[PDB]
Amino acid sequence: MVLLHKSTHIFPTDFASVSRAFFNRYPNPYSPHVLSIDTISRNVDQEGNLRTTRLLKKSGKLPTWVKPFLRGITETWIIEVSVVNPANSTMKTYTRNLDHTGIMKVEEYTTYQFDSATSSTIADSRVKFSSGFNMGIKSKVEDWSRTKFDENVKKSRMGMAFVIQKLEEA
Amino acid sequence: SASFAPECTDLKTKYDSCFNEWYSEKFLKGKSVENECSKQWYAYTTCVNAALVKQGIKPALDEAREEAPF
Ligand SMILES: CCCCCCCCCCCCCCCC(=O)OC[C@H](COP(=O)(O)O)OC(=O)CCCCCCCCCCCCCCC
Q1: Strand partners for A114
Q2: Of B23, B28, B65, which is closest to A53 when you measure between CB atoms?
Q3: Would the annotation count A26 as a binding residue?
Q4: Strand (E) positions, A105-155?
Q5: What single DSSP character describes residue A6?
Q6: How far apart are the first and last CA of chain B?
Q7: Is A51 within 8 Å of B34 (Cβ atoms)?
Q8: What distance, in Å, lies between the first and last C-alpha atoms of chain A?
Q9: CA A158 to chain centre
């Protein structure tokens, strides 16, 4: 089963503020489940774009109803891959879980693009939930996915806004 | 902001601080592409890789680093 979700948000500040916030998003009070983050690789490429791979550890908890199907999962590793193009004022980002992928794979693409005509940075997000391991009942897994997508949409943008602020206030 | 390996956290902070200056003041202004944080970077990444070697996730991470999402 595959479930695709999409959302858009506008941050009314410049590319430098958003992209810096992204690299410095943790910790913030809207993501209390992020235990750590590390930079695994970073280099400027052939075209002058910044390529970064990071590794996050996140805690969590399964809803009670999945008990007879799934054992206790309370932590997950997430890879986060990004490309910053300073000439275009574009930042592309990708995240997915590294473990538990046999149970559920959750992939997120989010692009931040500065729009000069409106002096704002637009964030487009698409998230794909994929699983071939059918545990438990399909519509409950779908409900879970909608709930999770919505939660993450809000956590992501609230955290970003928190950090953009804090850096604005020095 | 912690590293997954606590002995690397203070090294991470130092690298992050150096990068943050370079990113804002040089990279985004098109004033550099050199690795002006190599000292802080190579110290930090040495501590991390030593830690990752013992981590169950390392093979999945190694695989993920070969993929090209964009
Ligand atoms: C009912 C059955 C459930 C089965 C359970 C299986 C267990 C495995 C599931 C875990 C998968 C989660 C990893 C998903 C990775 C992913 O694709 O992207 C989402 C990831 C993590 O996803 P999760 O919050 O769902 O774990 O984003 C994060 O890093 C969240 C960190 C904490 C909140 C900070 C907010 C940032 C969110 C993203 C920022 C990007 C900007 C735009 C967003 C709108």
Answers
A1: A121
A2: B65
A3: yes
A4: 105-115, 120-130
A5: E
A6: 28
A7: no
A8: 46
A9: 12
